[PDB]
Amino acid sequence: NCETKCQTPLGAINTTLPFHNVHPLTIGECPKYVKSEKLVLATGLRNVPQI
Amino acid sequence: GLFGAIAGFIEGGWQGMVDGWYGYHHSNDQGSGYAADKESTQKAFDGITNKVNSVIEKMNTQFEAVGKEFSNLERRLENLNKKMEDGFLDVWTYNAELLVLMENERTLDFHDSNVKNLYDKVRMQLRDNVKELGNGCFEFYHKCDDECMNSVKNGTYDYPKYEEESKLNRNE
Amino acid sequence: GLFGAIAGFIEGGWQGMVDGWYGYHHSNDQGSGYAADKESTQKAFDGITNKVNSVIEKMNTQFEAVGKEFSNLERRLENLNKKMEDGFLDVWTYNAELLVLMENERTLDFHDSNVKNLYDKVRMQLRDNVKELGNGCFEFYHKCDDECMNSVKNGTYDYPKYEEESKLNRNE
Amino acid sequence: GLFGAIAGFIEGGWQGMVDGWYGYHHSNDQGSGYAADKESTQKAFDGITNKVNSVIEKMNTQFEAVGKEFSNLERRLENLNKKMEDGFLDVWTYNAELLVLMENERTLDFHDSNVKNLYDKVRMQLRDNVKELGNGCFEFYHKCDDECMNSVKNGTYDYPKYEEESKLNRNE
Amino acid sequence: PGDQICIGYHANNSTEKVDTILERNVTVTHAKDILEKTHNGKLCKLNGIPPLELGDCSIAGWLLGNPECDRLLSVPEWSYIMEKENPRDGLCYPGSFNDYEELKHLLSS
Ligand SMILES: *[C@@H]1O[C@H](CO)[C@@H](O[C@@H]2O[C@H](CO)[C@@H](O)[C@H](O)[C@H]2NC(C)=O)[C@H](O)[C@H]1NC(C)=O
Numbered sequence: 001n002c003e004t005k006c007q008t009p010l011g012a013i014n015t016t017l018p019f020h021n022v023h024p025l026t027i028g029e030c031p032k033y034v035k036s037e038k039l040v041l042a043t044g045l046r047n048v049p050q051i
Numbered sequence: 052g053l054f055g056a057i058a059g060f061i062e063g064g065w066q067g068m069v070d071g072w073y074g075y076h077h078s079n080d081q082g083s084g085y086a087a088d089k090e091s092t093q094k095a096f097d098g099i100t101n102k103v104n105s106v107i108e109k110m111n112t113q114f115e116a117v118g119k120e121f122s123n124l125e126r127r128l129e130n131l132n133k134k135m136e137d138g139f140l141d142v143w144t145y146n147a148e149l150l151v152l153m154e155n156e157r158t159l160d161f162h163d164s165n166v167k168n169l170y171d172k173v174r175m176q177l178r179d180n181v182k183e184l185g186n187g188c189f190e191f192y193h194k195c196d197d198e199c200m201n202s203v204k205n206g207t208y209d210y211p212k213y214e215e216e217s218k219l220n221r222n223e
Numbered sequence: 224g225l226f227g228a229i230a231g232f233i234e235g236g237w238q239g240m241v242d243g244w245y246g247y248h249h250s251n252d253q254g255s256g257y258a259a260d261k262e263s264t265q266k267a268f269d270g271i272t273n274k275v276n277s278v279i280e281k282m283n284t285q286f287e288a289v290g291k292e293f294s295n296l297e298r299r300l301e302n303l304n305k306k307m308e309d310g311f312l313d314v315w316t317y318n319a320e321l322l323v324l325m326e327n328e329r330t331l332d333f334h335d336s337n338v339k340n341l342y343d344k345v346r347m348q349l350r351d352n353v354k355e356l357g358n359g360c361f362e363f364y365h366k367c368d369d370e371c372m373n374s375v376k377n378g379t380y381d382y383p384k385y386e387e388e389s390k391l392n393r394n395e
Numbered sequence: 396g397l398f399g400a401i402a403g404f405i406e407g408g409w410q411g412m413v414d415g416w417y418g419y420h421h422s423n424d425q426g427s428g429y430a431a432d433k434e435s436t437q438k439a440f441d442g443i444t445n446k447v448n449s450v451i452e453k454m455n456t457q458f459e460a461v462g463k464e465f466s467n468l469e470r471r472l473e474n475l476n477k478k479m480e481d482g483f484l485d486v487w488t489y490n491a492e493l494l495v496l497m498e499n500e501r502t503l504d505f506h507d508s509n510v511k512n513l514y515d516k517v518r519m520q521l522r523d524n525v526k527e528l529g530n531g532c533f534e535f536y537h538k539c540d541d542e543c544m545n546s547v548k549n550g551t552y553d554y555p556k557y558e559e560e561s562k563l564n565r566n567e
Numbered sequence: 568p569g570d571q572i573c574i575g576y577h578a579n580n581s582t583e584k585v586d587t588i589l590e591r592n593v594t595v596t597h598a599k600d601i602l603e604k605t606h607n608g609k610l611c612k613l614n615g616i617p618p619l620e621l622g623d624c625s626i627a628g629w630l631l632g633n634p635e636c637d638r639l640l641s642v643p644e645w646s647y648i649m650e651k652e653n654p655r656d657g658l659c660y661p662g663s664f665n666d667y668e669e670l671k672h673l674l675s676s
Pocket residue numbers: 003004014015
């Protein structure tokens with residue numbers, strides 16, 4: 001009884017993120033598929049513990 | 052880092068500044084506390100947002116693979132379809148992971164440059180009226196109170212005005 | 224910038240130097256005027272030309288799509304042809320736009336490094352015989368006339384020779 | 396270079412240090428010789444190995460083309476197969492050559508940053524107890540023997556202890 | 568005795584970790600995850616319009632009116648078609664279907 005804007009054979013997707021590792025074959029307005037495990041964008045700087 | 056500010060002399064960072072990314076705190080007998088730079092932080096923030104909006108939107112168009120079925124006398128065509136779609140997935144995956152890695156490293160060193168540059172910007176201002184401690188802090192050859200601390204911040208600390216008091220005040 | 228020279232202390236640039244990209248102008252009672260560095264400018268120019276010839280020729284080979292027609296029972300094959308050619312156009316388009324962006328940024332910061340480095344190169348030469356104004360200009364603790372200005376340019380200003388006049392000349 | 400250390404002031408390098416990538420040699424009446432930095436060299440080595448293992452393994456998956464035969468009524472399909480496989484070879488070839496070029500340049504400038512940073516790290520330590528010769532060498536306003544030379548190396552040369560001898564010792 | 572002014576940057580409790588070419592797992596103040604790893608494990612309608620489930624029937628079995636495909640005799644509009652890998656009910660009388668795949672692709676539209 002669920003509804004979605006993006007569907008894959010394994011399940012549906014609700015996401016604002018412009019990518020997924022889930023399944024190559026999709027139907028809808030969907031984020032782009034890749035084979036990556038992790039995709040992580042550095043925004044801030046390195047963490048140096050205050051010493 | 053690459054510009055040597057972070058895990059260089061500054062050696063660590065201050066949990067006590069929530070005001071933005073980088074900045075100062077001072078010891079005035081008048082008063083002491085953490086205040087962070089408006090202009091530099093603003094600039095860096097803008098640049099970063101531009102970097103993420105630049106990447107995430109550099110795949111707007113990008114390969115999307117939908118469906119297909121072939122007979123058992125179509126085997127070559129099937130294998131070709133597979134090799135192509137797989138090939139492109141591989142390609143865009145590489146493109147993505149790599150771009151992320153680069154933009155990451157470049158981002159961190161970017162922050163470094165920001166810091167070191169802010170520092171050098173202060174130094175080239177106050178230079179001979181103060182001792183550089185080498186720890187990323189400036190010890191005074193006179194008193195800059197706070198209004199004038201904030202004049203250091205705003206970028207004009209009025210050098211020659213405070214020149215003499217420190218000129219004799221130093222040596223010893 | 225990234226090395227802090229441009230829109231850093233130098234704060235702007237001189238329409239009065241057409242001689243090349245970066246350089247100096249001096250105040251000698253003897254004379255004053257704009258003359259720009261031969262070696263640095265030469266180097267940067269060479270590096271840049273190498274960068275553009277390196278990019279434009281990094282697509283020499285690159286995907287070119289010509290023609291095709293399919294029957295209405297060929298629909299899958301047609302769609303596959305379309306998805307492939309489109310896919311590659313997308314790929315090379317991305318590759319191009321991105322490479323341009325990077326090489327651009329890297330080019331600008333490159334110029335920065337050139338400038339800041341030239342400066343530091345002068346400073347480490349003349350250092351204690353002059354005051355750094357912090358604006359990207361060197362005030363003299365003695366007179367360097369012009370021959371010797373051009374000796375600053377050529378890279379040997381003969382420090383110890385001019386050492387003493389400034390050694391006593393400074394302080395005050 | 397980009398950070399101006401190499402083919403900048405340092406002007407060349409020492410065949411007499413096999414101990415690692417960069418470091419020092421000193422003149423003590425006590426003794427003189429080449430010893431290279433443990434921590435910096437270690438760091439750079441690690442970073443580099445991470446870069447090569449990062450590239451060579453960023454093609455682990457990557458396009459591999461095997462075989463095919465078509466009839467003479469299959470000519471379009473053949474041409475499509477050819478254009479695709481060729482297309483991908485071109486793509487991965489570009490990706491490889493380019494990545495190598497970038498990572499190369501970035502590697503060299505990386506070494507530069509390492510050097511210049513090590514230098515600035517020394518300077519911000521010993522600063523007013525010594526004259527910078529501008530050649531990338533530090534002349535002494537006192538004697539640091541060797542234990543304390545190695546204290547310079549280990550990062551604490553104990554400034555105030557040696558402050559006074561040089562404080563009066565300098566001038567002249 | 569004196570007056571002084573330091574310079575420095577931010578820091579927090581963040582364990583958030585990124586990578587780079589030069590440096591492996593590295594902890595930073597802030598980061599964005601650009602990858603979506605999760606799904607609700609369900610098959611759903613698509614913008615209010617539900618898919619057509621072929622159940623145990625193939626496309627052939629459906630269009631041809633295989634008796635085992637019954638509820639499919641009349642069906643409303645669909646957002647997409649759910650068919651199994653190796654559906655049970657296709658051609659009950661053995662046979663062949665010409666240009667089957669071209670037809671299914673036609674159905675994709
Ligand atoms: C898709 O995700 C959004 C965001 O999580 C869901 O919309 C939210 O629904 C919850 C619960 O009703 C509300 O508290 C939020 O205010 C909603 N946010 C937004 C932006 O709409 C939505 O339910 C999800 N779609 C489905 C059907 O699962």
